Design a protein around this ligand. Sequence first.
Ligand code: CLA
Ligand code: CLA
Ligand SMILES: CCCCCCCCCCCCCCCCCC(=O)OC[C@H](CO[C@@H]1O[C@H](CO)[C@H](O)[C@H](O)[C@H]1O)OC(=O)CCCCCCCCCCCCCCCCC
Ligand SMILES: CC/C=C/C/C=C\C/C=C/CCCCCCCC(=O)O
Ligand SMILES: CC/C=C\C/C=C\C/C=C\CCCCCCCC(=O)O
Lengths: 34, 188, 238, 144, 60, 51
Amino acid sequence: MLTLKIFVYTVVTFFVSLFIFGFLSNDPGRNPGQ
Amino acid sequence: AYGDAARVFAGNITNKSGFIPYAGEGFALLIPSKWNPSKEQDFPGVVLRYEDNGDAVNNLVVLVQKVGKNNIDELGSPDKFLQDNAYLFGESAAFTGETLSEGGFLPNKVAAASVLDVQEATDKKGKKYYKYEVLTRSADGDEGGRHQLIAATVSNGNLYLIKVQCGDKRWFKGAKREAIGAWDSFTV
Amino acid sequence: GNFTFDELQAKSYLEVKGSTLANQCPILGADAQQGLGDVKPGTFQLDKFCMEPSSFKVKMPGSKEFEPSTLLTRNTYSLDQMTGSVTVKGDGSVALKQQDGIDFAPVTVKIRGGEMVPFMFTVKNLNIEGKADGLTGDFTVPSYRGATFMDPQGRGAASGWEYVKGLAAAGAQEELAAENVKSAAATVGEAAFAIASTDAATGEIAGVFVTRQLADDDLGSKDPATIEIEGIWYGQLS
Amino acid sequence: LDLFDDRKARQAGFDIIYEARDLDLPQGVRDGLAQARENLDVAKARIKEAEKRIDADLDAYIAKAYWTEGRNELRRQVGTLRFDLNAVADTLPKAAKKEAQAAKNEFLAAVEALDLQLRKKNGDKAAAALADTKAKLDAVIAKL
Amino acid sequence: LVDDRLAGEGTGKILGINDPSLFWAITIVFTIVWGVFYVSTREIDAASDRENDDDFGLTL
Amino acid sequence: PEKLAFYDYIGNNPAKGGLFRAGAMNSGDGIAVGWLGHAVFKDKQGNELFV
Ligand code: CLA
Ligand code: CLA
Ligand SMILES: CCCCCCCCCCCCCCCCCC(=O)OC[C@H](CO[C@@H]1O[C@H](CO)[C@H](O)[C@H](O)[C@H]1O)OC(=O)CCCCCCCCCCCCCCCCC
Ligand SMILES: CC/C=C/C/C=C\C/C=C/CCCCCCCC(=O)O
Ligand SMILES: CC/C=C\C/C=C\C/C=C\CCCCCCCC(=O)O
């Protein structure tokens, strides 16, 4: 059961870190406006 | 037509005591105004029955039975009189079996009655009364128990008895006032 | 266990809460004498008598061997805070009787085939006697369900329909006469206790137990199975 | 049904729960604050019982390191001590009631210190605080 | 007892960490993603054809 | 007549069926074969009772 908890924690933190550091990567500049 | 004007700008309420007086054949009592007449005759000798609009558990009934004795004490002691008239709380005749899985009940018993208070007193006229206060509990335990108020007397060779029922749930929510008022107003 | 009475009382509710330490029985210290020990013969007041099971086995009706089971109802299967009386004789015979306390806890387990087997773990009205090596007795097992319990279709013993209200056309339902009758009758079980340690300084005892009883029958609508429960127990004499 | 004699239950306090729920009665009557002020005998008996219980049971629990039991005892039956002390001290002259209030404040600060030490799970500090609390309670009882 | 369990629900742990392995997993994954982002954040900014001065960003 | 008795049956009442109860009434209640008789209920004192 501890292995499942470790695996789920790893997956969740991976996806949340992806979300955070993707929205930190100059997101407002990705628009078609001139 | 009628011609009666509407009671506009009237600062008085016609009835606010919460009780409606009743004059019967040899007895009188104050019936709660929020109750309605009923057509049920559960006990022998029923001459009056009223039940609450919001709950049929709250009710009162008046029994006038024929007896030989001219006085209430000749029917026995108050404990003996209550023991003889134990059918007023109903019977568990439909349940025919043995069980041991009840909460606070004797074996093979799904109901019980706790005699909380007994009293013997005489009215202003000089007629003796037998007053009881019981709390009957069920195996399932609906309403958290039922409160039974009984006042019995004998007049002109007939036994006059009143039983007022009120669920505990309504009893502690403020409906004990009407039940106690109806119980204390029984005059013969 | 792995904790004594003093160690348990030295904690806080906020520290015990959620750690499953409230579903366990205390063990004795190093001062405990083996067996009966040096207890003066006489009748004591039993208190803080608890029994913590450590294994459940189920023998299905039609089998001659017990089978392992997996618990499904979490940490709710420990009887604790029971009170009674304990009498010790000069020869060594001990008699134990249980009067009050939390002496029952419903338990549900699953077996190899996949069938849930509810049962009513209890030592209600325990009456055992014998030597400190082993005490053999019996107890009463009340019905799993009460008399006022109503089944999915609203059929109960002391409250509910006496037939199937859904099937209106079938006037008598002679085919369903078996399941329309509910009986919350009680049964009995057997126990075999033992004493392994005793501390006469503070009046504490401990040992092991093995009990046999019957599963539920859905108010007389099933054939009960036999379940064997074994584990440790603890009590205080004063 | 089957009759049972429970007429002695009312003498055991059967009407406490029903009186506490009576919305017609004032809040003081429901909470029991009116009865204690009317009858100071109950307040005096409660104060004496609280003092005796504090002494004996606090000694026993701190000796055996029963922190939860000690705190619960400090707030199970002693739970009306502040109200009882206020009620008793309100029936005294100005100077006497002022001295009683000062002594009660000192005693309450002592109890707060003892409870803090019991929560922190100290033995010697809790024992010293308990001795001080007993002394202060004796002083405030003698003042009243 | 009959079986074994983690026995951690309703306790009040920081981020639900009862074992240091969970802390190690969280920290390692976060650090890896942060390092990958940190290497490239210089190149990403240059796609706007502007320097990251005090006037940078989406402004109105 | 048994016909007159049979006409006095809520099973033969047409407003007692269902939308997805397919088939004839013989498939839901069974084929009637005889009339049991008029059931008369009496009190312990002899007074008649009606259901
Ligand atoms: C022993 C541990 C340790 C290590 C390994 C480092 C290492 C580093 N520090 Mg220092 N630092 C430490 C302790 C440590 N520090 C402490 C305790 C403080 C508190 C005062 C600081 C304060 C500090 C500041 C304020 C700054 C640094 C900076 C740097 C980085 C400069 C190189 C860089 O520009 O590449 C670019 C870096 C990356 C692309 C990351 C690549 C990923 C590698 C693996 C990073 C190593 C991460 C982690 C610490 C590894 C632990 C090792 C252990 C598990 C075996 C480098 C990652 C500078 C930095 O660039 O900050 C981000 C910076 O400005 N450090
Ligand atoms: C037009 C009106 C009509 C009426 C009133 C009747 C009346 C009767 N039929 Mg006849 N019948 C009809 C037309 C009609 N039929 C037609 C057109 C055919 C040719 C197919 C038949 C062939 C027929 C047979 C083969 C049988 C009858 C029988 C009967 C009796 C039983 C009724 C029953 O159970 O239906 C129940 C009907 C339903 C549950 C369907 C109702 C429609 C619902 C609301 C919607 C379904 C739509 C949905 C899109 C379906 C999806 C399908 C899929 C998902 C499963 C009843 C006296 C039975 C009998 O008793 O014979 C002695 C019998 O065996 N009928
Ligand atoms: C705070 C920094 C935020 C940075 C930006 C984040 C952007 C959004 C990212 C995604 C967020 C949603 C998904 C999160 C999934 C992982 C979390 C999870 O499931 O934890 C679930 C775990 C459950 O942990 C459980 O713990 C138990 C014992 O307590 C047992 O150990 C269990 O086994 C264990 O699972 O809970 C936590 O990890 C606690 C999280 C506490 C967070 C505190 C945040 C404080 C600062 C913010 C305050 C405001 C927050 C919002 C309040 C208002 C909301 C309407
Ligand atoms: C990167 C995302 C991964 C996707 C893979 C998809 C599904 C994997 C599913 C895992 C859930 C397993 C649940 C049961 C765990 C074992 C329980 C046990 O101890 O028996
Ligand atoms: C090179 C030295 C410089 C900096 C290092 C400083 C501090 C490191 C301290 C702690 C690292 C481990 C953290 C563990 C968190 C708690 C885990 C748990 O709750 O089990």
